[PDB]
Amino acid sequence: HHWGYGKHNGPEHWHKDFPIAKGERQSPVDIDTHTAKYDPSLKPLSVSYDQATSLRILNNGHAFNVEFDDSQDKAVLKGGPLDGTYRLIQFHFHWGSLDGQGSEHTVDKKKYAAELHLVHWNTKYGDFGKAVQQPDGLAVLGIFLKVGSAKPGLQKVVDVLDSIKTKGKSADFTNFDPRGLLPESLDYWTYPGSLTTPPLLECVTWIVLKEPISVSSEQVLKFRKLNFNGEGEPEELMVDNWRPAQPLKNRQIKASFK
Numbered sequence: 491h492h493w494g495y496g497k498h499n500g501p502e503h504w505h506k507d508f509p510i511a512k513g514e515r516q517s518p519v520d521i522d523t524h525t526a527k528y529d530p531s532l533k534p535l536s537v538s539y540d541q542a543t544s545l546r547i548l549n550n551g552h553a554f555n556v557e558f559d560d561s562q563d564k565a566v567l568k569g570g571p572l573d574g575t576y577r578l579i580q581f582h583f584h585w586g587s588l589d590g591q592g593s594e595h596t597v598d599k600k601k602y603a604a605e606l607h608l609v610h611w612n613t614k615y616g617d618f619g620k621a622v623q624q625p626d627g628l629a630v631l632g633i634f635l636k637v638g639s640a641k642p643g644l645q646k647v648v649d650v651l652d653s654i655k656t657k658g659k660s661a662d663f664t665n666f667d668p669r670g671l672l673p674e675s676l677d678y679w680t681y682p683g684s685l686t687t688p689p690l691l692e693c694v695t696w697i698v699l700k701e702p703i704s705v706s707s708e709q710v711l712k713f714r715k716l717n718f719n720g721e722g723e724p725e726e727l728m729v730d731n732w733r734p735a736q737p738l739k740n741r742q743i744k745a746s747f748k
């Protein structure tokens with residue numbers, strides 16, 4: 491009876507195995523654009539993905555992860571609210587059964603069709619496992635998806651999903667350039683929060699881009715053909731793998747832009 495997004499194991503039940511689900515810095519949150527304050531001391535964000543080395547794509551039963559080689563300082567996030575250097579380890583998405591829901595963060599209560607999470611860990615803790623035990627251990631760059639024009643840089647991801655339909659399947663996924671998933675502008679909101687899946691650890695500085703990327707209806711329809719279940723198990727479409735917005739509590743959301 492493992493956690494998930496179904497009628498009996500979804501986010502309302504997580505607190506029973508992971509009591510930090512009711513904690514002081516949980517994610518995602520609603521971003522109230524009229525309450526977020528412009529912070530002119532935020533530095534420009536530095537996204538350095540030219541040497542990023544993708545390795546593999548895995549259906550983990552909750553999402554799919556595109557995994558990177560993080561054994562050296564290649565693909566790094568720095569600047570903005572961050573102190574020091576954060577190394578790219580994986581990206582994944584959260585998405586809906588229909589275009590009107592799917593994102594984890596919301597903007598003035600607007601839900602986007604999906605949300606990309608590029609996950610980075612703070613190199614001063616030496617490995618990912620140590621980093622998640624620290625309040626400043628991870629930096630997650632969140633990017634909204636809306637349905638419109640295709641994203642050309644996403645199609646190589648869409649075209650491998652058929653080969654990782656079910657839980658536990660993986661495929662070689664080398665030479666993928668995550669620069670192709672970014673919007674034009676790096677304007678962002680930031681706040682301290684958590685992983686949005688169990689174990690819900692409170693180790694994340696969230697950096698949420700204001701500008702969504704456009705993907706096509708055909709591209710997200712292929713996400714929604716994935717399965718939560720393992721091979722030879724009853725088919726459960728991988729849809730609605732998002733956690734809803736959590737209380738803000740004693741937190742401020744800061745904007746990088748006027």
Ligand SMILES: N=C(N)c1ccc2nc(-c3cc(CC(=O)N[C@@H](CC(=O)O)C(=O)O)cc(-c4cc(S(N)(=O)=O)ccc4O)c3O)[nH]c2c1
Nearest residue numbers: 557558579580607609618622628630684685686687688689
């Ligand atoms: N590249 C590798 N060698 C490697 C090895 C192990 C790894 N474990 C994870 C991982 C696990 C986890 C969970 C974790 O802590 N432990 C797991 C498994 C376990 O340790 O028993 C669990 O309890 O389910 C989360 C993330 C991750 C998830 C999100 S979100 N939006 O909440 O889905 C955001 C950022 C995240 O970092 C993970 O990245 N990423 C890993 C990468």
Ligand SMILES: [Zn+2]
Nearest residue numbers: 582584607686
């Ligand atoms: Zn995520």
